[PDB]
């Protein structure tokens, strides 16, 4: 089928009043979370969050826990380092975020890798798409860049991202294929709400879809319209699928001129909805 991704997200938040940073790590295949670690949870282990990962054996869980704990310690250090680089007080809480991962394309081979790092919610340092060179946002990140160049960190990451990362992504995709390689096309419908005697709102709903990427667009007499429209952020249903809606306000009696167009990977051709009641 189409392209796929494996991504890991990490957040560390310093606690200057007492104790260690809060650290939360999540792993995804596409739009499906499959593992978590939370430093405040009781297990102190990497934990499963999808059924298809539960079959991995103890060597896997020990290794993932080992890696994620070490990562947490690296962020602990970084929080101290960066507070120094930025000449900040010991009094405040600060945040480190890292995301990394790999995509496979339509040919099921490596497509791209990424590794990005942020401090206090702003870019700090990122690996370029070539997986060979770094983008440093400021002179603090420049110091990190020189550290990481000297240590050949990009070479190490590139080897993972082109090899191990995509090999494990492909394993997960096969072992979880019943869901991970199922596309759930949006279940669509339109509702109608009078706003006055003269105008009505048409709302085009897309429900229970997976993956999350979707496009909803209104047309009037076959031409895209954005004026007098509203689009909500795509939102999780809680059962692993997503929802979205788009609405347009129209002159009452002219509803049939308007069409909602829905594009999604699960739809071989886009759907067109029209109020003709």
């Amino acid at each position: 089928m189409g392209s796929h991704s494996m991504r890991y997200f990490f957040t560390s938040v310093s606690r200057p009043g007492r104790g260690e940073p809060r650290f939360i790590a999540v792993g995804y295949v596409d739009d499906t979370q499959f593992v978590r670690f939370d430093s405040d949870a009781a297990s102190q282990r990497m934990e499963p969050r999808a059924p298809w990962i539960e079959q991995e054996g103890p060597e896997y869980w020990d290794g993932e826990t080992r890696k994620v704990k070490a990562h947490s310690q690296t962020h602990r250090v970084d929080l101290g380092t960066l507070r120094g680089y930025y000449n900040q007080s010991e009094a405040g809480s600060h945040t480190v975020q890292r995301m990394y991962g790999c995509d496979v394309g339509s040919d099921w081979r490596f497509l791209r890798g990424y590794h990005q790092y942020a401090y206090d919610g702003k870019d700090y340092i990122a690996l370029k798409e070539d997986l060979r060179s770094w983008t440093a946002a400021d002179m603090a990140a420049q110091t990190t860049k020189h550290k990481w160049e000297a240590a050949h960190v990009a070479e190490q990451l590139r080897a993972y991202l082109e090899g191990t990362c995509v090999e494990w992504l492909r394993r997960y995709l096969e072992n979880g294929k019943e869901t991970l390689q199922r596309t759930d096309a949006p279940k669509t419908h339109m509702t109608h709400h009078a706003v006055s005697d003269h105008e009505a709102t048409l709302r085009c709903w897309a429900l229970s879809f997976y993956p999350a990427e979707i496009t909803l667009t209104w047309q009037r007499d076959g031409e895209d319209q954005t004026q007098d429209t509203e689009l909500v952020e795509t939102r999780p249903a809680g059962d692993g699928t997503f929802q979205k809606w788009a609405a347009v306000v129209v002159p009452s009696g002219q509803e049939q001129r308007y069409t909602c167009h829905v594009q999604h990977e699960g739809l071989p051709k886009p759907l067109t909805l029209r109020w003709e009641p």
Binding site: Y8, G27, Y60, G63, E64, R66, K67, V68, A70, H71, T74, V77, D78, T81, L82, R98, Y100, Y117, Y124, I125, T144, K147, W148, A151, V153, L157, Y160, T164, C165, W168
Partner: peptide, 10 residues
């Protein structure tokens, strides 16, 4: 499967 064995400090 995470990158390992560890990330370098900043």
């Amino acid at each position: 499967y995470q990158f390992g064995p560890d990330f370098p400090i900043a």
